[PDB]
Design a protein around this ligand. Structure first.
Ligand SMILES: *[C@@H]1O[C@H](CO)[C@@H](O)[C@H](O)[C@H]1NC(C)=O
Ligand SMILES: *[C@@H]1O[C@H](CO)[C@@H](O)[C@H](O)[C@H]1NC(C)=O
Ligand SMILES: *[C@@H]1O[C@H](CO)[C@@H](O)[C@H](O)[C@H]1NC(C)=O
Ligand SMILES: *[C@@H]1O[C@H](CO)[C@@H](O)[C@H](O)[C@H]1NC(C)=O
Lengths: 255, 89
C-alpha cells in the first residue's frame, strides 16, 4: 500500500453510481502500452476518493498489510500507513501527496511486475536521481552497531506466527552493499521493534528487508549456556543481522 | 497551625502556574498527616509513581498508572546497595 518513491499520473476520480472494480479495470489497461509504468496503486479514504497512480522504478515498497502497526500513534509519525487523520471537523476533503501520503473504507493496495529494464535517457521518464552517497564516517559506523549471525543456528518452520515488517529493495537502484546499508539503517529508526534484520533473494529483481523481534525461543531446561536453544524464522535468509543489545545504567523498573 | 511541606509545594507550584500563568502537570496528593502519599501523579493520572517520604522521586518505579505496592525505606536502600553506592552490608 505504499512506495515512498515513484508515482506517475495520479488520476484522481471517484465512483458515483459506478464502483471501484472498474477503477481497477481502468488503470490496469493503462499499463499495457508503454514502458513508463511497472505497477500501480489503488486507494480509498472513507469512501469515494480513489487514486490510480502508476509506478515507474520505485526504490522500495514498505509497510505491508501483515506487519505490526500499533505503537499507539497516528497523524504525527504515521509515515507507515501514509494517512494523516485530522480532526478540525475536516471529514470530507480529499488530498493527495507524492508517496500516496494522503491528508484526510481504507483499501490501499498495490501491484507489481512489469519485468522492467530501460536505457539511460532512452524511453526515459523517471531516473533514480540524487542517490544520496552516504559518508563512510556515518555509513561505515552503523555497521558495527550490529552483528552478523552464523546461519547454522537459525532453523526454519514456516508455521510459527511471527509478526514482522517487510520491504522490497529493487536491484536497479540499490547495490549489494546498499541493500544492507538501507535495511540496517532502517532497523535503527525503529528503536524498539527491530532485533533481527535479514536480506533474502527469492526472485531476481529485488532485495527484501524483513525486520523481526527477537525470535529466539528457548526450552524449559535450566542450563547455563544458550547452546540448547536457537532461532526460528519462516524462511532461511541469505544474510542476518542482530541489533546488539545496548543496556544502560539507572534501571527503569523496581523488580 | 502552620503548613506542611506538601502543602507548601502544592501552593508554590500552583501560583507559579498563576503568576507566570504557565501550567505544570504535577501537583502532590498528600494525606491528612502532612507527609506525602507514596503514590504520586497529576490530574490526568497516566503515570503514577512511588515517592520517598522525604520528597525525592524513587528512581525506577514509574509505572503506567497505579503501583500495587510501593517500596519502603529498607528495600530502596537494600537495592541501591546492590547497585553499588557503598557499604556492602
Ligand atoms: C455498484 O455496486 C452497487 C452495489 O454495491 C450496485 O447497486 C450498483 O449497480 C453497481 N454499479 C455498477 C455500475 O456496477
Ligand atoms: C516522531 O517521533 C520522534 C521521536 O520520539 C519525535 O522526536 C517527533 O517529534 C515525532 N514526530 C512528531 C510530529 O511529533
Ligand atoms: C503447521 O502445523 C500444523 C499443526 O499445528 C500442521 O497440521 C501443518 O501441516 C503445519 N504446516 C506446515 C506448512 O508445516
Ligand atoms: C514567574 O513567577 C515568579 C513568581 O515568584 C517570579 O519570581 C518570576 O520572575 C516569574 N518569571 C520567570 C521568568 O520565572
Amino acid at each position: 500500500q505504499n512506495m515512498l518513491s515513484g508515482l506517475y499520473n495520479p488520476i484522481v476520480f471517484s465512483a458515483s453510481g459506478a464502483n471501484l472494480t472498474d477503477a481497477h479495470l481502468f488503470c490496469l489497461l493503462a499499463c499495457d502500452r508503454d514502458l513508463c509504468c511497472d505497477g500501480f496503486v489503488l486507494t480509498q479514504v472513507q469512501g469515494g476518493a480513489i487514486i490510480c497512480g502508476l509506478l515507474s522504478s520505485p526504490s522500495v515498497l514498505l509497510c505491508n498489510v501483515k506487519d505490526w502497526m500499533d505503537p499507539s500513534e497516528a497523524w504525527a509519525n504515521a509515515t507507515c500507513p501514509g494517512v494523516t487523520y485530522d480532526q478540525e471537523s475536516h471529514q470530507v476533503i480529499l488530498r493527495l501527496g507524492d508517496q500516496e501520503f494522503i491528508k484526510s473504507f481504507q483499501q490501499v493496495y498495490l501491484w507489481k511486475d512489469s519485468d522492467m529494464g530501460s536505457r539511460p535517457e532512452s524511453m526515459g521518464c523517471r531516473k533514480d536521481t540524487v542517490p544520496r552517497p552516504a559518508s563512510p564516517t556515518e555509513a561505515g559506523l552503523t555497521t558495527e552497531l550490529f552483528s552478523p549471525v552464523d546461519l547454522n543456528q537459525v532453523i526454519v518452520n514456516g508455521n510459527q506466527s511471527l509478526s514482522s515488517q517487510k520491504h522490497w529493495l529493487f536491484k536497479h537502484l540499490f547495490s549489494a552493499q546498499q541493500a544492507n546499508l538501507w535495511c540496517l539503517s532502517r532497523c535503527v529508526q525503529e528503536h524498539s521493534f527491530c532485533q533481527l534484520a535479514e536480506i533474502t533473494e527469492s526472485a531476481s529483481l529485488y532485495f527484501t528487508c524483513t525486520l523481526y523481534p527477537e525470535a529466539q525461543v528457548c526450552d524449559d531446561i535450566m542450563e547455563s549456556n544458550a547452546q540448547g536453544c536457537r532461532l526460528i524464522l519462516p524462511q532461511m535468509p541469505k544474510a542476518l543481522f542482530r541489533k546488539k543489545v545496548i543496556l544502560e545504567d539507572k534501571v527503569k523498573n523496581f523488580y | 497551625a502552620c503548613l506542611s511541606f506538601c502543602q507548601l509545594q502544592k501552593q508554590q507550584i500552583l501560583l507559579s502556574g498563576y503568576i507566570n500563568s504557565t501550567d505544570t502537570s504535577y501537583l502532590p496528593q498528600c494525606q491528612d498527616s502532612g507527609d506525602y502519599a507514596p503514590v504520586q501523579c497529576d490530574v490526568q493520572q497516566v503515570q503514577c509513581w512511588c515517592v520517598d517520604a522525604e520528597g525525592m522521586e524513587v528512581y525506577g518505579t514509574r509505572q503506567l498508572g497505579r503501583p500495587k505496592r510501593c517500596p519502603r525505606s529498607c528495600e530502596i536502600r537494600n537495592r541501591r546497595l546492590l547497585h553499588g553506592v557503598g557499604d556492602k552490608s
